[PDB]
Write a protein that binds this ligand. Structure first.
Ligand code: HEM
Length: 391
């Protein structure tokens, strides 16, 4: 209780900015820690790896209770197998590598356009203009939905994410209700337009799957809304994080420039050191013993991704950025694992590669024009602004 505040002060500004020193104590001394409220924190790589992916780990109860976020219950994120596999089939077939090569053409075009527009030495707000809008429009093009709402989409997800903290402030649930009301209204308008003017994008595919009985109508519309809303979000964070990293560690940007074959490794090390999603929940459908601690069926288990990605039992010098870590020790948990591993992962890596590549094509050096403005919490990392100058 006061023990919980010492290990994981979820609301503390310092913990929120950089929890990683606290994660060490957790992982070393309290690897399976039961909080006050009943949630077990699981922070060792081995335990996250082995346990989070088990068939007994249900994703159902938390999202079903999540108020405004219950929309996730009608997607892969909040649905267990067997139906999980069928929801995932609906979108996986849209995001094979060859399909993704074509989708990220949009990413490349928009980045090139932005960069063509600038004057030498001009301050670029990299979070909106190189991260959020390119990825938002990329996904909207795949869906075949209108492309022009990135800014209000991003504000809405900013508001919807507040209640995902382990310690929501008063009113954060209400703010999420407002956010999801907006996204629902926008999706409803866009789908009425699509009934009268159908396309052949991922949104038309999902609607057809619901008409064909493969998924429900609610599941089609919830999947549309989620992919449309989050297309910019965690991927927008990874892009901005990598840009900041290129700026504070220019030898990394130079390596990315000089060595095409290192690119996937560099992006994967960025992803390891700064996951945008710091945990997820699971609800075991039967008792399970982890680290010698018996967790009862139904108890919340919060698997700590960020903490696990610095496990020194797996990663030597875990707080050191090193893109040369060997294949035997370069697997991180930032995209999850098991059947729920991120449904955006192949397009995410390709979008981040595209933006960094365009930058690499045109410049030698990234600098921060001022300190970045961030809005992190215990659950998700987030930039508000990332002013840069390219040379
Ligand atoms: C850097 C980018 C991203 C990271 C680091 C990330 C992280 C994650 C994590 C940690 C999970 C597992 C959640 C859990 O198991 O409860 C997840 C799942 C998911 N993500 Fe991503 N995410 C990213 C980008 C995206 C994008 C662009 C999309 C839009 C397609 C997306 C859509 C999803 C969906 C639908 C799931 C649920 C998959 C399932 O339950 O089978 N993500 N993501």
């Amino acid at each position: 209780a006061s023990i919980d505040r010492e290990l994981v002060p979820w609301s503390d500004p310092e913990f929120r900015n950089n929890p990683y020193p606290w994660y060490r104590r957790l992982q070393q001394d309290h690897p399976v820690h039961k909080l006050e409220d009943g949630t077990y924190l699981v922070s060792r790589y081995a335990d996250v790896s082995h346990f989070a992916k088990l068939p007994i780990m249900s994703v159902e109860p938390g999202w079903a209770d999540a108020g405004p976020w219950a929309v996730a219950s009608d997607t892969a994120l909040g649905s267990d197998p067997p139906h999980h596999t069928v929801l995932r089939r609906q979108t996986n077939k849209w995001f094979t590598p060859k399909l993704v090569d074509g989708w990220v053409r949009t990413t490349r075009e928009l980045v090139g356009d932005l960069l063509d527009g600038v004057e030498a030495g001009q301050v670029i707000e990299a979070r909106r203009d190189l991260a959020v809008v390119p990825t938002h429009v990329t996904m909207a093009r795949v869906l075949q939905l209108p492309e022009d709402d990135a800014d209000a989409v991003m504000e809405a997800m900013f508001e919807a994410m507040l209640m995902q903290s382990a310690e929501p402030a008063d009113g954060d649930v209400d703010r999420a209700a407002v956010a999801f009301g907006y996204l629902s209204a926008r999706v409803a308008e866009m789908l009425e337009d699509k009934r009268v003017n159908p396309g052949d994008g991922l949104a038309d595919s999902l609607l057809d799957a619901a008409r064909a009985g493969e998924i429900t109508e609610s599941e089609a519309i919830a999947t549309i809304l989620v992919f449309y809303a989050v297309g910019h979000m965690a991927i927008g964070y990874l892009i901005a994080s990598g840009i900041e990293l290129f700026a504070r560690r220019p030898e990394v940007f130079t390596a990315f420039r000089n060595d095409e074959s290192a690119r996937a490794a560099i992006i994967n090390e960025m992803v390891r050191m700064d996951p945008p999603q710091l945990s997820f929940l699971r609800f075991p459908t039967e008792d399970v013993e982890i680290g010698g601690v018996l967790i009862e069926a139904g108890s919340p288990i919060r698997f700590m991704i960020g903490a696990a990605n610095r496990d020194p039992e797996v990663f030597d010098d875990p707080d050191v950025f090193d893109h040369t870590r060997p294949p035997a020790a370069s697997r991180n948990l930032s995209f999850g694992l098991g059947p729920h591993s991120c449904a955006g992962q192949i397009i995410s890596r390709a979008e981040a590669t595209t933006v960094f590549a365009v930058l690499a094509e045109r410049y030698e050096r990234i600098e921060l024009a001022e300190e970045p403005t961030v809005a992190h919490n215990d659950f998700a990392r987030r930039y508000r602004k990332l002013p840069i100058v390219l040379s």
